[PDB]
Amino acid sequence: RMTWNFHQYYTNRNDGLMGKLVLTDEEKNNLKALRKIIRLRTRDVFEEAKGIAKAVKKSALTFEIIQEKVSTTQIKHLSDSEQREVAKLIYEMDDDARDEFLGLTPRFWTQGSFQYDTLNRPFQPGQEMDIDDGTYMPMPIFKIGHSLLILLVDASLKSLVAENHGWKFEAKQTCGRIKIEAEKTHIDVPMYAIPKDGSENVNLALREGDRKWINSDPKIVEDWFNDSCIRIGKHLRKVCRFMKAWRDAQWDVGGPSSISLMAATVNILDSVAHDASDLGETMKIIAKHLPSEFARGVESPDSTDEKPLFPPSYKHGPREMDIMSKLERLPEILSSAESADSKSEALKKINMAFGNRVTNSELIVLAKA
Numbered sequence: 001r002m003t004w005n006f007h008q009y010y011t012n013r014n015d016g017l018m019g020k021l022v023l024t025d026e027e028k029n030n031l032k033a034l035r036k037i038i039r040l041r042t043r044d045v046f047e048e049a050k051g052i053a054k055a056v057k058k059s060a061l062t063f064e065i066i067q068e069k070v071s072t073t074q075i076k077h078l079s080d081s082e083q084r085e086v087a088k089l090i091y092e093m094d095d096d097a098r099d100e101f102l103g104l105t106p107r108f109w110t111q112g113s114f115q116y117d118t119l120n121r122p123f124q125p126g127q128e129m130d131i132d133d134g135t136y137m138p139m140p141i142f143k144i145g146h147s148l149l150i151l152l153v154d155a156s157l158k159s160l161v162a163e164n165h166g167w168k169f170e171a172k173q174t175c176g177r178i179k180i181e182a183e184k185t186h187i188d189v190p191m192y193a194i195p196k197d198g199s200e201n202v203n204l205a206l207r208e209g210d211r212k213w214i215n216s217d218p219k220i221v222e223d224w225f226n227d228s229c230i231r232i233g234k235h236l237r238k239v240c241r242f243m244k245a246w247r248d249a250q251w252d253v254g255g256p257s258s259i260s261l262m263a264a265t266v267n268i269l270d271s272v273a274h275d276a277s278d279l280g281e282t283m284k285i286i287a288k289h290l291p292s293e294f295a296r297g298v299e300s301p302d303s304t305d306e307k308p309l310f311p312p313s314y315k316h317g318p319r320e321m322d323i324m325s326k327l328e329r330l331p332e333i334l335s336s337a338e339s340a341d342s343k344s345e346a347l348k349k350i351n352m353a354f355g356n357r358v359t360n361s362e363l364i365v366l367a368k369a
């Protein structure tokens with residue numbers, strides 16, 4: 001029968017969905033610049049703290065003098081009690097802890113969609129691009145305190161926020177965050193302890209709760225996804241972008257996580273025949289199978305995760321039910337677009353899935369299927 005084809009609608013890098021979703025080089029460079037600012041300040045803060053520790057190694061300074069020294073560094077941007085705590089922790093170090101600290105130089109690695117190239121331009125007002133730049137503290141396997149490390153990273157991020165109008169700090173359970181509302185951007189800074197020189201010894205720092213650390217190596221997800229792209233093909237990054245774009249269009253705030261969409265989509269494309277020469281059909285195939293993937297619970301590609309990426313249906317409350325509803329509707333949307341009574345209606349319908357981003361109906365062509 002006659003059908004509308006959406007392959008260019010999806011893939012066209014001029015003004016198709018890929019063209020609308022991929023960051024411009026100016027945006028990508030802006031994110032790399034922001035990343036560099038954070039990394040340099042974090043390096044500096046640790047050097048400033050280490051300078052104080054060096055002074056105390058040389059002579060057992062009074063608490064008051066150590067406090068004075070702290071107040072001249074970037075740590076002056078923490079609260080008074082936090083400054084006290086930093087000075088107290090430096091004061092309380094024994095020779096071994098201090099020697100270990102003097103040998104610590106933070107390292108950095110970006111995780112998430114900036115790293116494996118699936119970061120979309122944000123859609124709705126309020127939505128922001130994220131760059132996830134982790135800070136890594138090489139230490140003996142378990143020697144340098146959870147409290148001090150978090151205070152120093154917080155000092156770095158808070159000192160930058162104090163110097164830049166329109167920057168805000170947010171403490172999250174798994175990271176420090178700088179939000180730049182006007183740039184529709186935030187940078188997330190998770191902190192890890194790793195061995196000094198094996199994913200079992202990569203420990204993510206948690207801010208509050210019964211645990212200070214949890215073993216969660218972001219490299220596991222990065223390698224899993226990069227390997228999946230190689231295995232499945234160049235269309236995997238594209239259809240993950242498209243599913244994330246659908247999520248951004250259906251929910252202002254909320255919806256399924258990006259990682260849950262990636263995991264379910266990889267599962268489907270590993271197991272169901274599809275055709276990269278028609279990403280319209282491929283998206284319909286993915287859409288038909290996502291509800292079953294999500295209803296049974298979406299497993300993490302990291303087997304050590306304590307919970308699935310999305311819960312099985314007997315655990316659903318209103319939010320998961322809403323996500324299932326939208327997932328169920330998606331293949332119907334795509335099917336209806338395919339059989340629309342005109343090109344303009346085909347576009348209107350498929351944009352009910354991905355939002356009114358693509359406006360060029362010449363990317364939709366009359367086909368047979």
Ligand SMILES: Nc1nc2c(ncn2[C@@H]2O[C@H](COP(=O)(O)OP(=O)(O)OP(=O)(O)O)[C@@H](O)[C@H]2O)c(=O)[nH]1
Nearest residue numbers: 111112113118119120130132218221258259302305
């Ligand atoms: N093991 C594990 N890692 C996670 C989980 N959620 C997030 N992460 C890690 O955090 C990184 C960034 O996660 P997100 O910001 O949610 O996802 P993203 O792929 O960057 O997608 P967008 O920011 O929406 O573009 C992932 O690549 C993982 O390394 C999780 O549930 N389990």
Ligand SMILES: Nc1nc2c(ncn2[C@@H]2O[C@H](COP(=O)(O)OP(=O)(O)OP(=O)(O)O)[C@@H](O)[C@H]2O)c(=O)[nH]1
Nearest residue numbers: 111112130132172173174175188190204216217218
């Ligand atoms: N290694 C690792 N990193 C994670 C994991 N989960 C989240 N992250 C990182 O930490 C950042 C913050 O995660 P979250 O606090 O869960 O984001 P959120 O709770 O949705 O914050 P809001 O957008 O304000 O609702 C993410 O962008 C990831 O980069 C994880 O399980 N493992």
Ligand SMILES: [Mg+2]
Nearest residue numbers: 112113130132
């Ligand atoms: Mg991210």
Ligand SMILES: [Mg+2]
Nearest residue numbers: 112130132188
């Ligand atoms: Mg994020």
